[PDB]
Design a binder for this molecule. Structure first.
Ligand SMILES: Nc1ncnc2c1ncn2[C@@H]1O[C@H](COP(=O)(O)O)[C@@H](O)[C@H]1O
Ligand SMILES: Nc1ncnc2c1ncn2[C@@H]1O[C@H](COP(=O)(O)O)[C@@H](O)[C@H]1O
Ligand SMILES: Nc1ncnc2c1ncn2[C@@H]1O[C@H](COP(=O)(O)O)[C@@H](O)[C@H]1O
Ligand SMILES: Nc1ncnc2c1ncn2[C@@H]1O[C@H](COP(=O)(O)O)[C@@H](O)[C@H]1O
Lengths: 303, 320
């Protein structure tokens, strides 16, 4: 029994919406291939409830899902089952209405702009074709579904993505990399440091050669693909989990690589014992040069 | 796993809508009591699926359910579980817009007018109450759900009810009985049907008589009188006793032939499922099963009190 209960009506609508569409899809055959129309398709559902089921849900709302066949295929290629995705959004309210995570920390939910949604349609075909070609092995943001909510006459656009960080292992310091950190921001529980703060601290990321080489083999293909699309101004979200600080149950630095898809252990010969998280964020809203600077500045953080 | 496949889009939307609303209801706690608003309540969902999921369903349609908290409770009082109900309607298309049976013959779906849907609201509080105090034991139609569908901008109203007939047993002869000082009979056009709808003077002419024995005749007649008085107060009339007759030996032979053609219980029913069914006594000529219920209590010189007594006198004579 799912009461779509959450801080605000908008989150309840989202939970209702993801639940309803994922169920609807369970009645849609998986096709042998995506067709051009799947990329201009949508589901729209309008709800008008009078004196019914309004304990958590507004009585009136709209929910629109863009290209459900495409995003369901994306979910599959990213190794995510529809029931788990549904459960993570729907079992319990997402937590902190501009940037959320599901209650299990597996997925992130980003409110975006109209033009952002237009940009996603513009790249969706190639993005898909690339996700296929690279067999789901990529540092790119992982687009899991995309939605428009209408509550109280107001439209809100959202994109669901795989959390870059672990959904268990606590992150102890985050670097946004392409410039330094604000003052009011350095006084947060977890500050968002930048390129300089990183090079200042002289931070280092030691990870088995394979991790570095393999990590860069892919980092390159991805960036090369973002340039091929004339995109830029995207950062590399980096998380650091320091094992000792957080130190029947789970173990230290223990994690399930099939879930925490972006996690990398320290080297057999490394200073502190750490788990690192890394992926590309914010690709929605020279650029060929952007890629090469990005690609080099990053390569110079891995030994 | 459900395609909502059907011969007409209206049926697909029906299957979709019952499926959808029963699932929503599953996430809605079952309340301690019903409230007055529950009798004024409704759900309305409008769908627009562009270039998506259009193999069986239309791209655009509307589904409205009246008073769903109430109908859920009615299903429960009638001993119908919501999942079974949903499955009977959705597992495979209903059969035969403007009168359908579910594929398993448990439920019936009647297309009704908007005047009918209004009468349902008018009488809904009393009807529910009446269902509570007779414990679900009635010959009356058992209303399980009420719906408005919109396809191609056209509105269609539907009521879902329990089948008067067995979902298993075959009916070999059937009657619609009101009983009046008028003329009621099977037209030369009806008799030409496989299962004709015979009426009052047919039943009298052929001198039929149903043999259920006293213990059942009494239980039955106590229901009728109460049911018909309730209808009486509500100022209702023009309803019939739907009578079906199953011949046990004739079905046993029918089954045998069904096997021979293909290859090349015995008059037993679950009174909890086949709710209107009565075995014949041990002193009956032919061995039979009967099905009897009141139908048509909404719009399709005598008065309503007269009718109740008259209708009741006739049915009383039918048994023995
Ligand atoms: N199938 C599509 N193809 C291209 N652009 C779209 C599509 N759907 C929505 N958009 C754009 O995304 C933004 C939001 O559109 P809407 O879903 O009407 O709110 C607008 O800029 C639309 O033009
Ligand atoms: N994929 C992601 N997983 C987890 N957290 C994220 C992700 N993308 C952005 N964030 C965080 O959410 C905040 C808003 O993102 P942005 O607006 O892109 O800076 C940032 O401070 C990030 O730390
Ligand atoms: N809550 C209600 N109480 C009484 N009559 C109603 C109610 N809802 C609908 N009706 C009647 O049912 C018919 C069709 O209703 P609708 O198309 O749902 O607005 C019309 O005669 C309405 O006035
Ligand atoms: N609840 C019911 N169960 C089975 N058959 C019914 C039921 N109601 C009506 N019928 C039959 O369906 C047809 C239409 O009924 P009506 O609309 O009352 O004339 C007639 O053949 C009736 O005998």
């Amino acid at each position: 029994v799912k009461l779509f209960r959450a801080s605000e009506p908008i989150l309840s609508v989202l939970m209702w919406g993801v639940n309803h569409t994922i169920n609807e899809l369970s009645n849609v055959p998986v096709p042998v291939m995506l067709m051009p129309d799947d990329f201009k398709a949508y589901s729209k559902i309008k709800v008008d409830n009078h004196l019914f089921n309004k304990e958590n849900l507004p009585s009136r709302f709209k929910f629109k899902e863009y290209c459900p066949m495409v995003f369901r295929n994306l979910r599959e290629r990213f190794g995510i089952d529809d029931q788990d995705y549904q459960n993570s959004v729907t079992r319990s309210a997402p937590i902190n209405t501009r940037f959320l995570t599901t209650y299990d920390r597996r997925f992130v939910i980003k409110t975006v702009s109209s033009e952002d949604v237009a940009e996603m349609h513009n790249i969706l075909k190639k993005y898909h074709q690339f996700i296929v070609e690279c067999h789901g092995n990529t540092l790119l943001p992982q687009f899991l579904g995309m939605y428009r909510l209408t509550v109280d006459g107001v439209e809100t656009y959202m994109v669901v993505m795989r959390n870059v960080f672990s959904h268990r292992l606590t992150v102890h310091r985050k670097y946004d990399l392409k410039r330094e950190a604000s003052d009011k921001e350095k006084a947060k529980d977890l500050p968002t440091f930048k390129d300089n703060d990183f090079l200042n601290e002289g931070q280092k990321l030691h990870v088995g050669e394979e991790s570095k080489k393999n990590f860069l083999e892919k980092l390159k293909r991805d960036v090369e693909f973002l340039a091929q699309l004339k995109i830029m101004d995207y950062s590399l979200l980096v998380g650091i989990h320091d094992v000792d600080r957080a130190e029947r149950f789970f173990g230290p630095g223990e994690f399930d690589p099939s879930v925490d898809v972006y996690a990398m252990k320290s080297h057999e010969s490394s200073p502190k014992k750490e788990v690192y998280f890394m992926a590309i964020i914010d690709i929605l809203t020279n650029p060929e040069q952007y890629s090469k600077r990005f690609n080099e500045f990053m390569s110079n953080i891995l030994t």
